[PDB]
Structures are given as C-alpha cells and as structure tokens.
Design a protein around this nucleic acid. Structure first.
Ligand code: MG
Ligand code: MG
Lengths: 29, 116, 328, 201, 51
RNA sequence: GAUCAAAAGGAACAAGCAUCAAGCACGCAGCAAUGCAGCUCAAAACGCUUAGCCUAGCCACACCCCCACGGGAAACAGCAGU
C-alpha cells in the first residue's frame, strides 16, 4: 500500500504495533 | 424446534473416533451442538493422511450452488475449502499464511545462513 | 430601549398562584406548557422574585420540554434583569450556561452590553464577552462591538491570564475579524491566529479544541502568513511569538507530515520578510471607538419586528390553550 | 386445553416494567472516570477506547451548550477525521435530550448524513450518540469544509463448466464469461446504521 | 492488514456478485418448473387427454 | 421472493383398565340484540394407573406452588466432589 495511507494505521495504533517486511520471497524450498 | 436467531451456517461437524477425527458437512444450524440436527445431508471430509497421502473432501455443487443461494451463512475454515478448489475465490487467511510462513522461511533462510 | 416591549399585552399580577402549579405538575412529573413559564417571568416584582425564578427555570431546565423555553421568555426576563440590577444574578444565569440555557443571540444581546459601560463595572465584562464565543454568533453588527470590549482589557490586563485565557482572547478577535470594511478586521484576525498558535508547541492542539469552537486542523499561523500576503496584495504581537518558539499522551501526527517545531527557522523569514512590503505598501483601542460612531445605525428594525412577531406567538398559543380546556 | 393464567399476567406486568419504571439515559450510561467502569453495569472497555472515554467529548455533552441545541448544525465522527480526510459528516433536524441529567446529556438526535461528501436525503438516525468520538464543526470554515470532487472473471471451475455446456447447447461461445460487480455497491465498515435497528439496553 | 482488508472486500464483492446468481438460478428453477417452455405444455395437456 | 421458523388453523399420534359406561353445554345459527337444543361416546367418550419419546434425534423440566406478578424460601437435574 502507499505509505501516507499506511501512515494512518501507524497513527491509530501507537501503543501496539509490529514492524514487518513487505512482499514474500517468490519461492521456498 | 423454535430456535430464536436461526440461520444456516454451513459446517463440517465431527463424527469420528478419538485420535482419528472425521468431520461431516451438513447444512448446520447455529445454536445446536456439533453433533446436533441440521437441515440437509451433504458429502463428508477426510483429515487422514492415508495410503499415498490423500485427505478427501466431497462436493455436490449442484446443491452447494443452491444452499448458500438459500441464504446461508459460513465461517472461517470452510472458506478454505472452496477458495482452494476453484468454485469460490480464495480467502485472506491463506493469503496471509502461505506468505506468513514465507516470511518465517525468509526468517529461516537467514537462520540457516547465520549459523553456517 | 426599555419602554418599547413594556406595552406587554397585559395579564394577571400574582406569582404564587402559579408557584403552586408548576411544582405540583413536577410532583406529577408531567411537562409544563411554554406560555406558563413566561407567565412566571413577566410577573416579577421584587428582588426575591428573581431568585424563585432561577430555581424555577433550573427546574424548568429539568422538564420534558428541553426546548420550548422560547427566546422571548428569555427577553421578558432580560428586561426584568436589566430593570432591577443586571449585576450578579443576570451574570450568574450565564455562569452555568447549561442549567438555564438562555443563549440570547439577537439584538437582545445588544441590549445587555451597551449598559455595562453605563456602570463601567470592570471585573465581569470579561465574562459575558467570554460567553458569546461559545455561541455561534456575529451575523449581527456586534462583530465590531465584541472586539470593542476586548481591546478595553487588552490595555487593562497583560499577564499569562490563565491556562486557557490565551485562547479566550484570540477567538474574540478572529470571529470579530471577518471584516470587509477595513484593514482593522484584517488586523484583529492576526492577533487571533498568533495566540491560538502559541499553545501549538506548548500544550497541544487539544487546548485549541476543548470547548470554544475552533478546528482540529493544525494550521493557523500559516493562515495568518497567507493573509499577510493579501495585506501586501491590497502587527506588534507576532514578532514576539516568532522568537519564543525557537527559544527554549497520544500521537496525532503522521511521521511523514513534519512536526512544526522543526519549521521554526522556516517561520522566521516567512513572517519577517513581507513586513518590509507592509511599510512600503501600507492606536488599536481608539480606531474601534470610531466604529462605535461611524457604524451602528442601531438596527432595531429586527428588534421591533420580533416584538410584533411575539404577538404572533402568544396569541396563537393561548388560542390552542383555549381549545384544550373546553373539550373537557 | 388448560390455559396458562398466571404466566400471561407476568407477561404483561413485566412488560409494564419494560416501559414505565425504566432507568433513564443518564442513570445507566453513566461512567467512572478513574477505573473506567460503570455504575449499575460494572464492566470495562477494550484497549482502543480507554483514553477516548476520558479525554474527548460526546455527541450531546457538547450540543447542550448552544442556542436551540444547534438546530441546523454539522458534526463528524472522530475517526471520520482519521479514516476519510474527505469531509464525512452528519447534520441535525431534531433533538430529544434528557432532563434527568444534571449536566444535561445522553440524549437522542437525528439528521442529514453525507458520507465522504456523498449526500443523501430523507434524513435517517444518527449513530453512536453515547460515544465520545463526535466533533463539533464551528460556524467558520463551512464552504471550504465541503471539499469533495466494473467486472471480474469467474473462478476456474465455473469457467470450464459453462463453456463446455455451450457446445452441448450448440454454439462454442469462447466469449469470456464475466460476472457483473456494478450491480453490487461497496459499503465500508464505519458507514453508520439505523439506530432503531438496535433496541435500547 | 490493509491489503487483506481489500482482500476481505474483494472476497466480499465477487461472491456477493455470485450470490445474486445463486439466488436467481433456483429462482429460474422455481420458474422453469412453474412456467417453463415445456411446463406450459403440461398445463394444457393434462386437461387435453382428460376431456 | 426464496431459506428457516414460532404463534395460529386443520389432520394425525403410547401403554393397561369398561370392575372407568355415560360425560355434564360438553353445540349451532345469525353482521348483531338473540334463537334453537344440541354436541362427544360401546367403531371406547369420560376417567384412573404406568411410562420420557415414533433416536442423524426430539420432547419436557430447570428448588417448589402446572406458570411466577406474587409466595414458599435461599435450591449443582453445569464439571469435579460430598
Ligand atoms: Mg417452575
Ligand atoms: Mg440438587
């Protein structure tokens, strides 16, 4: 998603937020 | 029975032994138990990795067209059944989790590289 | 000003014949008619009959008619308050502001702030002018007349004034500062946009939106710093704020949209550099006492029209009162 | 058949406790400002709303401070500042507040909705009146306040069945079967409902 | 979440856009049984031999 | 409009005992005041006594007074326990 839209979700959830990667890897063996 | 707040939630319902469970789809009713009564008979499901590893599910779709078209409700694990099949589109609980463990595998391919 | 409504289209002249009726129906806990509370108001004839009414209006505040306390029931008590004292029990009614619910937003408001300078009455003209910001107002020519009173105490009072009285000054210049007449109402709004924007990095924007109707938006200095361009297309207080900010609870902001404690060098030349044009293109107390005189043709034409509109009210409601007690 | 004479009498005597001696709106929707519990009910609140009860302001703790309670005013939900930066708001036509409350509040009202700057007529009921996420739009900034400006494919097995039915029906018709989503609108989750769809507890 | 929220939405759209098809198909079968193109032959013929 | 489903209407639907053989308005007309005197039953009425049941299970009860305003009174016929 765009970050300014994503900034809204950061703006709501100050006290309880995780930090995650974006896309997955294309394969797993 | 006169059940207040009645709506068909379409469910697999347990009917197998202990330690080999076996759930059965019937067009279930909301407030009744797992092994209570239901609306109509459907075609069951196998959670058992058998000879040559298959775990069967049955679908008569001349009626699973009809019975949600009768205004039925559904909950989470059976959205896994028809999204995976090609009759319904896929639910956002594998879309996270096939990639969530791919984020765990990405956390694991570094884990297998930060040791070696 | 007094002798115009006081052709009152007469009624009876007792009060305790009514005072054993409204509370009796309150001990039935049934609602009370709208002409029956004005009739408890236009029979007030001593000092003690003022305070029985503020009980009874407070009791009438707790009634199944939260509305139907008509604005002319207020005015026919405004004339009683302006008659007797208008010193403490007129203002004590405005003090609670929810327990009496008067809200006198018409030219009746102009009946009650011209006569405070006629007794000069310093300490409390702050308070009523504070208690019209909380009303949505100033579609009448009290716009000049409101900021006319606050410039009297801008010279009188120079402190930190309170926790919240910084906001109590600027909002009583900014909604007065909607003037298409001059540079003066475009000068008063800048005092508002400054002082509302100085708690922005001191206490927070929740100060801006406690109780008096400001906005949840962040930008008010930049609103001044855009209309100061229009002052240069068509002020001794904002320089003091321009240094003090660069001088030494929930999150509202985005991390992308920048904190305005990091725009304080960008607040200096954005404000300073266009004042060079404002000497090259183009005190405060006395220039509004001109507006006391040059303006104010004394629009009582919406006052006496309302007085004849209140003969329309009482007659057609005592007519349906006549209907209810004949069918029995 | 044997009639049930007493259980019918308590069917209606209970039901004339259901209307008559109800606790009015400020006796049970009253709150604790310290422990964030409630008198007469006792329970507490989820983590996303503990401060909002304590910090911010109601829908009619505020509107009990205006002439005719703001008979033509505008109002927004607090997350409609945070979920739509487009203006999304409610207007007012009628107030039913309460008289039992010292510091009169907890009432009812209704009026005009307009979602995200999409206007609707025949005014319906305002929601969440008891909450503290409701914002008092001032008289300044109105005309710039209002600042506002098909099909998807079939799932894979239903592709193979309709097409191979068509050569049974006679004509090949490789013409891509495409169900219509234009018939079905796209309602979001903070879009308010009917308040009389809920009954009072 | 936010890409899943539209995937909740784009779950909710199409199967609802399928749901009106699921309703009308049996409503084309309560209509083919009642008023189908061979069903009109049924209504005339059951009186035709009978008279 | 389907789905599901009360109330309601109608037809069904246990056991033993005629040494339970008569029940005692149990009927109908008329928009309505009112009218007629009928209705059920030996092809089992009416009443006792016994029983959870016509098991993808259902019905009934939820300390007692069929119910529960009310009263008795302070109630595991939730699990584990006594
Ligand atoms: Mg009982
Ligand atoms: Mg017991």
């Amino acid at each position: 998603p765009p970050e300014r839209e994503l900034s809204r979700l950061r703006r709501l959830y100050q006290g309880h937020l995780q930090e995650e990667s974006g896309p997955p890897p294309e394969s797993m063996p | 029975k006169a059940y207040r707040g009645g709506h068909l939630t379409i469910r697999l319902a347990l009917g197998g032994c202990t330690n080999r469970p076996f759930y059965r789809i019937v067009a279930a009713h909301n407030k009744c138990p797992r092994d209570g009564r239901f609306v109509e008979q459907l075609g069951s499901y196998d959670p058992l990795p058998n000879s040559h590893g298959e775990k069967l599910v049955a679908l008569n779709l001349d009626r699973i067209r009809h019975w949600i078209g009768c205004g039925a409700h559904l909950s989470k694990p059976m959205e896994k059944l028809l999204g995976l099949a090609g009759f319904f589109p896929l639910h956002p609980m594998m879309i996270t989790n096939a990639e969530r463990l791919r984020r765990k595998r990405a956390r694991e391919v570094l884990l297998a590289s930060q040791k070696t | 000003d007094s002798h115009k409504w006081e052709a009152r289209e007469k009624e009876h002249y007792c009060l305790a014949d009514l005072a054993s009726l409204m509370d009796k129906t309150f001990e039935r806990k049934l609602p009370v008619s709208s002409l029956t509370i004005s009739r408890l108001i236009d029979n007030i004839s001593s000092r003690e009959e003022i305070d029985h009414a503020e009980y009874y209006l407070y009791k009438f505040r707790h009634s199944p008619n939260c509305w139907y306390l008509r604005n002319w029931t207020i005015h026919t008590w405004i004339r009683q308050c302006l008659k007797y004292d208008a010193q403490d029990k007129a203002l004590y009614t405005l003090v609670n502001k929810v327990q009496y619910g008067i809200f006198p937003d018409n030219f009746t408001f102009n009946l009650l702030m011209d006569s405070f300078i006629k007794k000069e009455n310093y300490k409390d003209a702050l308070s009523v002018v504070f208690e019209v910001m909380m009303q949505e107002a100033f579609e009448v020519p009290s716009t000049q007349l409101l900021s006319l009173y606050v410039l009297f105490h801008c010279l009188a009072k120079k402190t930190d004034f309170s926790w919240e009285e910084e906001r109590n000054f600027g909002a009583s210049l900014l909604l007065p500062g909607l003037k298409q007449k001059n540079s003066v109402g475009f000068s008063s709004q800048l005092y508002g946009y400054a002082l509302l924007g100085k708690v922005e990095l001191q206490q927070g924007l929740r100060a801006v939106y406690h109780n008096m109707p400001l906005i949840w938006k962040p930008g008010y200095l930049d609103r001044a710093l855009q209309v100061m361009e229009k002052v240069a297309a068509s002020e001794a207080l904002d320089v003091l704020g321009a240094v003090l900010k660069a001088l030494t609870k929930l999150v509202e902001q985005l991390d992308i949209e920048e904190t305005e404690q990091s725009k304080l060098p960008q607040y200096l030349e954005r404000f300073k550099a266009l004042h060079s044009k404002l000497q090259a293109l183009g005190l405060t107390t006395q220039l509004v006492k001109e507006k006391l005189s040059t303006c104010e043709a004394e629009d009582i034409a919406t006052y006496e029209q309302n007085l004849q509109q209140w003969h329309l009210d009482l007659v057609q409601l005592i007519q349906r009162e006549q209907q209810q007690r004949e069918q029995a | 058949v044997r009639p049930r004479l007493i259980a019918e009498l308590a069917r209606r005597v209970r039901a004339l406790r259901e209307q008559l001696n109800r606790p009015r709106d400020s006796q049970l929707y009253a709150v604790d400002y310290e422990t964030l519990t409630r008198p007469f009910s006792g329970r507490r609140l989820p983590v996303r709303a503990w401060a909002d009860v304590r910090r911010e302001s109601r829908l009619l703790q505020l509107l009990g401070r205006l002439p005719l309670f703001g008979l033509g005013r505008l109002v927004t939900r607090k997350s409609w500042l945070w979920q739509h930066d487009e203006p999304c708001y409610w207007r007012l036509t009628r107030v039913r507040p309460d008289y039992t409350a010292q510091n009169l509040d907890h009432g009812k009202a209704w009026g005009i909705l307009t979602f995200k700057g999409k206007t609707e007529s025949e005014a319906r009921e305002i929601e969440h009146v008891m909450y503290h996420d409701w914002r008092l739009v001032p008289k300044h900034e109105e005309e710039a306040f209002t600042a506002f400006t098909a099909s998807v494919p079939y799932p894979p097995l239903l592709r193979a069945m309709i097409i191979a039915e068509r050569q049974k029906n006679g004509d090949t018709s490789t013409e891509e079967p495409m169900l219509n989503v234009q018939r079905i609108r796209m309602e979001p989750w903070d879009y308010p409902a009917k308040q009389e769809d809920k009954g009072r507890a | 979440f936010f890409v899943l929220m539209e995937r909740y939405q784009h779950y909710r759209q199409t199967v609802r856009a399928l749901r009106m098809e699921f309703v009308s198909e049996v409503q084309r079968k309560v209509h083919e049984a009642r008023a189908g193109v061979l069903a009109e032959r049924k209504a005339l013929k059951d009186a035709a031999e009978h008279r």
